[PDB]
Design an enzyme around this catalytic site. Structure first.
Site, mmCIF file in Angstrom:
data_model
loop_
_atom_site.group_PDB
_atom_site.id
_atom_site.type_symbol
_atom_site.label_atom_id
_atom_site.label_comp_id
_atom_site.label_asym_id
_atom_site.label_seq_id
_atom_site.Cartn_x
_atom_site.Cartn_y
_atom_site.Cartn_z
ATOM 1 N N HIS A 1 88.528 104.613 4.144
ATOM 2 C CA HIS A 1 87.692 103.749 5.677
ATOM 3 C C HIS A 1 87.038 102.836 5.505
ATOM 4 O O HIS A 1 87.180 101.763 5.713
ATOM 5 C CB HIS A 1 86.939 104.997 6.627
ATOM 6 N N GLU A 2 85.730 102.204 4.613
ATOM 7 C CA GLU A 2 85.090 101.207 4.760
ATOM 8 C C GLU A 2 86.034 100.122 3.604
ATOM 9 O O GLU A 2 85.923 99.432 3.935
ATOM 10 C CB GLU A 2 83.979 102.035 3.646
ATOM 11 N N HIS B 1 87.983 97.975 13.193
ATOM 12 C CA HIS B 1 88.168 99.632 14.009
ATOM 13 C C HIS B 1 89.340 99.541 15.309
ATOM 14 O O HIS B 1 89.753 98.351 15.888
ATOM 15 C CB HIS B 1 86.757 100.402 15.078
ATOM 16 N N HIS C 1 87.628 98.121 6.116
ATOM 17 C CA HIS C 1 86.492 97.094 6.084
ATOM 18 C C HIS C 1 86.632 96.209 5.236
ATOM 19 O O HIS C 1 87.209 94.792 5.500
ATOM 20 C CB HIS C 1 85.217 97.768 6.968
HETATM 21 C C1 LIG Z 1 82.089 106.519 8.984
HETATM 22 O O1 LIG Z 1 83.083 106.228 9.972
HETATM 23 C C2 LIG Z 1 84.639 106.648 9.604
HETATM 24 C C3 LIG Z 1 84.168 107.503 8.515
HETATM 25 C C4 LIG Z 1 85.438 107.502 7.382
HETATM 26 C C5 LIG Z 1 86.919 108.277 8.851
HETATM 27 C C6 LIG Z 1 86.149 107.757 10.151
HETATM 28 C C7 LIG Z 1 87.908 108.590 11.052
HETATM 29 N N1 LIG Z 1 88.965 108.103 10.468
HETATM 30 C C8 LIG Z 1 88.865 110.015 10.326
HETATM 31 O O2 LIG Z 1 87.765 110.621 10.223
HETATM 32 C C9 LIG Z 1 90.027 110.303 10.201
HETATM 33 N N2 LIG Z 1 91.380 109.379 9.643
HETATM 34 C C10 LIG Z 1 91.927 110.445 8.731
HETATM 35 S S1 LIG Z 1 93.822 109.395 8.683
HETATM 36 C C11 LIG Z 1 94.185 110.878 7.668
HETATM 37 C C12 LIG Z 1 93.383 112.006 7.685
HETATM 38 C C13 LIG Z 1 91.936 111.582 8.205
HETATM 39 C C14 LIG Z 1 91.251 112.265 8.461
HETATM 40 O O3 LIG Z 1 91.507 113.512 8.667
HETATM 41 N N3 LIG Z 1 90.342 111.909 9.464
HETATM 42 C C15 LIG Z 1 85.471 107.233 10.363
HETATM 43 ZN ZN LIG Z 2 83.860 101.655 10.530
#
Ligand SMILES: COc1cccc(CNC(=O)c2nc3sccc3c(=O)[nH]2)c1
Ligand SMILES: [Zn+2]
Ligand SMILES: [Ca+2]
Ligand SMILES: [Ca+2]
Ligand code: NA
Ligand SMILES: [Zn+2]
Length: 168
Positions: free
Chosen positions: A119-120, A129, A123
């Site tokens: 995720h990071e 987002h 960015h």
């Molecule tokens: C710091 O903010 C953050 C940090 C990480 C993820 C997120 C948002 N994404 C998820 O939580 C997520 N994406 C996917 S993509 C395939 C599986 C999954 C899963 O199991 N979770 C937000």
């Molecule tokens: Zn984010």
């Protein structure tokens, strides 16, 4: 002449990263594997290449810190803010910071470092987002086996960099 590009993105395909320091929570090996896997998420669906540097200045400087750690985005102790990354650009641009008051893991407990890193680095590469609740780039962390990059994130990253080899 050159006008500034239409969107914030890296203007080169070869990017470097550096793991500046390490969390107490995981072995060096576990941390390195998590970050390598997180970069591969994005290199697999673009023409981007990521090379790790052991020292010196890399495009994407990665570090673990707490509270005030050298920018305008201080962390907040356990829970709350988890991590942040700066959009593409010079200096702090691309850099990724992780709150070392969180518990980082290579499992489903605490925060999964690979997943947060993936995720990071989104960015770091120019994604903000998504509103798609299943997207990697959704604002709220939730966490199964075998990670698959959702289509919303593929379309987003490819809008910036193209797909690279569509069948590698
Ligand atoms: C710091 O903010 C953050 C940090 C990480 C993820 C997120 C948002 N994404 C998820 O939580 C997520 N994406 C996917 S993509 C395939 C599986 C999954 C899963 O199991 N979770 C937000
Ligand atoms: Zn984010
Ligand atoms: Ca926190
Ligand atoms: Ca940087
Ligand atoms: Na920690
Ligand atoms: Zn920071």
């Amino acid at each position: 002449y050159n006008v500034f590009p239409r969107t914030l993105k890296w203007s080169k395909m070869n990017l470097t990263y550096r793991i500046v320091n390490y969390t107490p929570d995981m072995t060096h090996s576990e941390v390195e594997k998590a970050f390598k896997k997180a970069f591969k998420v994005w290199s697999d669906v673009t023409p981007l290449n990521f090379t790790r540097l052991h020292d010196g200045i890399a495009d994407i400087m990665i570090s673990f810190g707490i509270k005030e750690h050298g920018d305008f985005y201080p962390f907040d102790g356990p829970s709350g803010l988890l991590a942040h990354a700066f959009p593409p650009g010079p200096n702090y641009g691309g850099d990724a910071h992780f709150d070392d008051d969180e518990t980082w893991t290579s499992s489903s407990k605490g925060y999964n470092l690979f997943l947060v890193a993936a995720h990071e680095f989104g960015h770091s590469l120019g994604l903000d987002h998504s509103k798609d609740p299943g997207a990697l780039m959704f604002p709220i962390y939730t966490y199964k086996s075998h990670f698959m990059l959702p289509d919303d994130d593929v379309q987003g990253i490819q809008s910036l960099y193209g797909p690279g080899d569509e069948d590698p």
